[PDB]
A paper describes a structure:
To this end, we first exhaustively identified the interface CDR (complementarity determining region) sequence preferences in an antibody-VEGF (vascular endothelial growth factor) interaction system with experiments based on phage-displayed recombinant antibody libraries, and then used a structural informatics-based system to rationalize the CDR sequence preferences at atomic resolution with computational molecular modeling. The rationalization led to insights for a machine learning methodology, aiming at designing interface CDR sequences against designated epitopes on antigens of known structure. The results suggest that computational antibody design could effectively empower the high throughput recombinant protein library-based technologies.
Numbering used by the authors: 12 to 117, 135 to 253
Write the structure that this text describes.
Amino acid sequence: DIQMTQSPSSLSASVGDRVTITCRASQDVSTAVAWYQQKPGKAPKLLIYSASFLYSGVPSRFSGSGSGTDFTLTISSLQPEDFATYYCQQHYTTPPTFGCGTKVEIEVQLVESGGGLVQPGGSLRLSCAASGFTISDYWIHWVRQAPGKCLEWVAGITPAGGYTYYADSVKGRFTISADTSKNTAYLQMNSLRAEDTAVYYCARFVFFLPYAMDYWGQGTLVTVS
């Protein structure tokens, strides 16, 4: 597994400041790095792909650079709407392994559902419905965020359902799947633990361009109490 670390882990600046956030990968990842922006209470959105490429719709004050192990995100002139947590993530190998990102202070979709309250030992099933594309053409990943905690990759299924992958923390307890007639992916969660409490996101990925998690669902909250 390749680890990403950022610095700093948070910062406050003023409107108009130049902000740079650096990122390091534990191994050479070439230029296969993406940056994401995550508003509070929102799913991450793709800003930059392939290290220096602006995802469409992203303002040109955002720029990226680097290759090998060292990467940086620069916001040339910080705007009021730029406050968010920013994540550097390598997509050179799979599975992705997210961390804490950098907290900055001043059609196609996935829709999730099925979140709720359940008790330890219980079980629950999340849904990741797709629109405007065929779900089996992509990897689908489930990534979660505990309250006041960081991003954690949970599970992935390959296109055509060829293979599945699980984080050690859920292996043997969760199943990732899909139903193609419903164009919808699932995470079936058994033997739930309090640790499992979090907002769950799903997102699509392939190694084709831009080879970044370009679409995420809005997230669904799972409370284990």
